[model samples]
Target chain A: KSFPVLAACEHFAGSEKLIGKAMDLQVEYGPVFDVTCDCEDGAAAGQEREHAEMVARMIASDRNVHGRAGARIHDPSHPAWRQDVDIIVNGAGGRLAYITVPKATNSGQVAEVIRYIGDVAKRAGLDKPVPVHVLIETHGALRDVFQIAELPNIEVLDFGLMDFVSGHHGAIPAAAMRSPGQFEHALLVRAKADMVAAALANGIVPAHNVCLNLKDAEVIASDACRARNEFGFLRMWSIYPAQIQPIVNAMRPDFTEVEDAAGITYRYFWEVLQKAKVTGMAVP
Target chain B: HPNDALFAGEKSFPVLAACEHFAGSEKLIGKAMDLQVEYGPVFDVTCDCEDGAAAGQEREHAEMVARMIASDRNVHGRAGARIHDPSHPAWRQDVDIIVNGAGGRLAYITVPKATNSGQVAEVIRYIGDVAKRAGLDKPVPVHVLIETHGALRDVFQIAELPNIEVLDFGLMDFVSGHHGAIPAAAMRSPGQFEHALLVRAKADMVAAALANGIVPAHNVCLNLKDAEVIASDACRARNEFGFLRMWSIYPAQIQPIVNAMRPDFTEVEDAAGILVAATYRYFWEVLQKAKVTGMAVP
Candidate 1:
């Protein structure tokens, strides 16, 4: 039910070489990773084709690393979504565990991806439904999170704070989601919360949107603390190899957080029972 | 003595809520009525109407308490109630009985455990429903309390809820829920605001309120005995968190807390005005000299 730390490993036309390196990284990082197959760096049509080919290589390179593989795919509205779905789902024979649908908004687009995944699987005779995870990159997607979560086969909801910051189109300043004050801004807190609540309420695991400051472990720790302590985000993301371990450790409850967690739990259940008894709602 | 807290200080607050968020019995409801009567034109009674199944309270009993508050003669201020979270079983009843029974008397509601827009929408929707049921035209305003752990995530959207006048932080429960406080048994002398968890929560609360054009009230400054310390706490909430309103457990806080947080506005303004006038005079005099000498003033 909980997500392991996810790493985004990108860059290359060498499909076999990169996939082999990705499995090698599984030794340190565990199995889950995202091959940035999206047009994030403005991949030309040829690069998109190469990235799609790389996803199939990623699935084939699996050495029972016992971890799921994912791709950050172009949005559903793009022509690449259809091409990416056809190759990855069918070619991998449903081995691709999830698709990180970027710039996601609305149940309609989610439905298209879910149905598209199912259609691709049926033709290829794959057994399982490859769930579509979301990258909440747009303000529209941020607001429609609940509707998106309840869509069939939606597995995870992750914040793309950078895209969201830009997606606001100057209405929101980039500093609002940046550190030293990022977690303090009510709008950012609200966006993070909206994504988490929508996901948690609808049986989806929520990831802390990727921390942009990846080099400094202390900042990674601080952002992770904000994710866990303030907004209740269970999973975190990284773009660097050095970041994966720090993210996991940063989210780890310290001695103080551990002791306080127990106290809060005890008091919560204690009050629930005590209050229930008075109200005639406590069970025998 | 009855009107001691009502000093016409420099626009520190629009009007203090003089809240009664805890202790709701029939007697307390009447007691709140007196608060509205005595603190006229400056106060409204916000009841401890959260969780009908709360200790020694039920919806029917809370209905009667609401009836008492609603029946208050309009001496000066209005009447309101703080209802339970949407997740609670009797949350709707807390709304139903009060909004239904208050008959047109209740003017506002304070909803706790508002984590998302849907929960807030439930409040807004209910107030509209009640206005129709009670045959009243104006929708009652809602002041949501940011006490739940996850509420920080939806602070912006929730504040934008229609008729949401303010977003107040609840200190004790917030500390308990977030595990923010190092249990009192472990501490010598701890301030709730001293911890980063509560401070971050307060900052988010204030930022959301200010960004969305709503009022943010700091959670209770439990350091009641020293208004100076309490006043200092208010200053941080005002300056750092951008909160214009605050809650205090002691009456002693009203004057000093309000006065301390609101710095000398006219004090700085008078100086700013003089500086502006002096600059304008200097610039005009320079322009005249330049014209007389036929030299450039740029």
Candidate 2:
């Protein structure tokens, strides 16, 4: 059986296409689907809660899928936002969000989110827990990715590579994505990989955010191969349908004759167990 | 032969599929197929034992070769089985019978151990044996590899082993027996190559091999990129001495060595037409006067 693939669905403005895409992917690659809706206008309490409930109901009703739902919430310090977040977490079965917080959104913000999520779970009389998956987009988030990955019940953390690159290095994503002679691209890839590695090290499955320019399949394949082969990253989020095969192919192993010889050697070890025991007895 | 402990963490090597000396059996053929699918480029298989006489081993070897050919159609389908005695009456029956209509196949014979003045005599005996068994004196062109320590040390004495052949210097085992040094870098070291006695011995062997119409070939220059050094070394063997060609590891290195060794065509043509006439006239005058040997008046 194939392993579970986590497909993250990011909300695009004015289109219900993302929801249908999520449902289709859920049907195709079954079980453990996470739908994270990005709040478009950073809507108010009543509207945000109602939207979260609608998304949760649409996904939960699907027979092929089973998992927690999440939303991307703007900074809670914005007027009357706590009420909206509480309603979403407590009223709906959705557990996590791609949270937006102030400059001090390090371990302290993580602690506050966990407490709020816990309180919501408790009041809803639900055994199933809600968690926060913090998106590291802003300068504060990028600086504290290592610390924030350590946050309790962080189901997934997206690096927001473009935003992180732009915010950290002050270079535009298109220009700075791949530098020819310099190791800037390699360094950026390594940093993002290190973040994922840190998250994985802490027993959390880290998901790579989105690849913006997915036009050229070869570039996508090479990038994906470099990420998967050079760095140990298993999951990636795709913005387009064409980029899926290249990403999946990059994750597969190269099974050549050399690999076969290694396999045979491994099989031989198992087959010669009795011989090994006898040889050991004879020697000692 | 399949020892797992020998290579615990390391990757495995490619298997040789087609051999001119040894035949492959069904089980061995299956193993070769599996190896080809996994790794690639099956180096052809060659063995030490001769064909037909050893029933069990020969059958196993032939079966393996047939099965390998069946599985991998892309492989150059040439069967290589050994001849027991180079003098064996049926020597040609094994190699010629199997390889006939089978395309251009190369076969090599091993020279018997000899350590006396009657060196070529022993080789001639084996050649006669093969000739008598095979009916046709020269069924297929035979190539011989000089491998023994004694043979390398006294290579000149056995230069006439086979006609129309290339001579390979067996430095590994020869140096191991001679100087007690390892076969690898030690043999190729300047210390060993520049030794007065060793240089004289190798030069003498090369001189004898060339005189007997043998293409004096160096075994291998292991270092891939030191083409200039290797070209100079080869020139020492070819120009000052008389060795013909040297072996190359990388294909890129071939042209440089070839260009370095090649005689200037313009110089050769000028000498052939202009200098030859002058030299012939000078030699005739000297011969008429009956003078001592001297330079040609070119």
Candidate 3:
């Protein structure tokens, strides 16, 4: 229970082909990862309406078997964001696992979008509000994450490392966009530490950025290990099929050790309880 | 330790000379010591062992620092010594010679280029052991240089360590360590204050030091000839970043830095009249600093 989503999901699916592949994987692997169909970048400049509708149809389609599908909408300030919300909510509001709001500058912007999300879901006959995940990429967003985490229905806080590094205006170099450098640079370290602290304090999941080294499994695995063990990122992003299982493996408990712990703790606690009973004293 | 109520603010944080002059060789160290006598302890002189020692002369340089620290020219007890970093081969030898030679008289030991808190704590422990054997009644204070990525990452932990009096920023080394990420302009006045990464580093160090009841000192301004540029840098560092102290590399930089960091006369008058205990403790210290720096306290 310490890491609430440890076994539930560790990887994210992005592109169209990846989404289809992810749905098949979910069927084979039993909902171990999630699919965040990207509407922000997936749509052509003039095709936002058609794109949102396509995502809506996909969410309602039979391939979304486990209903663990979400959408990354345009930012709150984007002119097409409200339309994306309306189309998606009207189309498949009841089935969305969560809605990710990207590039919000502050908590007020996030609150404004969360308010609209709740209103849209309610109008579309959703009995409960749709969960929101925020992208902490902008300087303003990084400063306001403590307040943003406390907003209603925010389930996860995702780090956008590329955008964050770019936001520094070359003060942080391009090498910081990849492995070892991302984990080594001081500015990146501080941002990740702050985000992870904010998320854990408010009882939400803190997600790590994508691993750009797609061809190497060991690089991806080492990233997952550092992000999980050093900085306490419970969730991470994956751009390809090869990256997903390594992330999941890094986060999940060892099956043999899990079985042994269950058996060992069972007998251990049983004797402790019996000792308290014989002593006629309550255990603290 | 019981808090000194009257001098609460000053006792909690180090209120040392604003401009700390770094001298490497015999000529520069003696020159700095002469100026300290002329200026009346308003600035401190630190004998540099890290960058000062030439190849095959580290032990000789450390011994020179010990003799300088113990000499009669250290009139105000404001002269300190900077030892080699943990990565250097002569760091332990530097500590042994200096601590054994002048442990009781040395003002403080400045440890540079520590990557982590454990490295700093280990060096400090070794300093204590030598100082104990050297017949010193009290532990010599420590001033840590925050320049490495690992040091900045664990600043809070470093600040919480016992006997850490000041956390100083090393500008040139820090910029060089970034491997061309931060611009060269950031090692100077306006860019040093305005660059985002440098600004963040200064703010983080200051916050950590202040939160743990220690002093955060700013890095040196690179301009050696112009007093105005040094003054301007000092003013900005004192006002914007809450740095109570700064470092100096040249003799010309000392007086301007001290004058720029002086408490304003108007605020000192206001602080003098404030009868409340909480505010008075800080302002009383301000009044004392004004007197020392010749601010003409009203």
Note the B-chain TM-score for every model: 0.72, 0.50, 0.92
Q: Candidate 2: lDDT over CA atoms?
A: 0.45
TM-score of each model, in listed order: 0.60, 0.38, 0.55
**Model 1: how far is B97 from its true place, Å?**
5.3
lDDT of 2 by residue, B1-298 (tens): 2232334453222111111112234444344334324433222233333433355454344333323343343254322333443444444344433333123232333332233325535444545565455454454333344444445544665665544254555455344332111113335645335432234445656776667756565544555577776666556655655555454434334444454444454444444455334443323322321211111223
Kindly report which residue stretches of model 3 are placed more than 4 angstroms away from their true locations once superposed. A1-284, B1-11, B269-278, B292-298
| Model 2 stretches with alpha carbons more than 4 Å out | A1-15, A29-34, A40-50, A63-69, A75-84, A91-105, A169-174, A178-183, A186-190, A214-216, A252-284, B1-298
Pick out the ten consecutive residues of candidate 3 chain B with the lowest summed lDDT.
B1-10
Expressed as tens digits, the lDDT of each residue in A1-284 for candidate 3 is 12234232434544566667777887887666788878887888898988888888778788889888888899988999999899988897378878989999889999999999999998898987898889999999999987898898887899999888888979998888887889878888888867865676565778889888886889888998778755657678877778877777666544443444445435433433332322222334
**What DockQ does each listed candidate score?**
0.06, 0.00, 0.02
Q: iRMS of candidate 2, one decimal?
A: 24.5
User: Tens digit of lDDT per residue, candidate 2, span A28-62?
Assistant: 64422344544534343457655555544443454
Against the true structure, what is every candidate's RMSD?
A: 12.2, 24.4, 17.4
Q: State which candidate has the highest TM-score.
A: 1
- Cα lDDT listed for each candidate: 0.61, 0.45, 0.79
Model 3 clash number: 0
Question: What's model 3's lDDT at B88?
Answer: 84
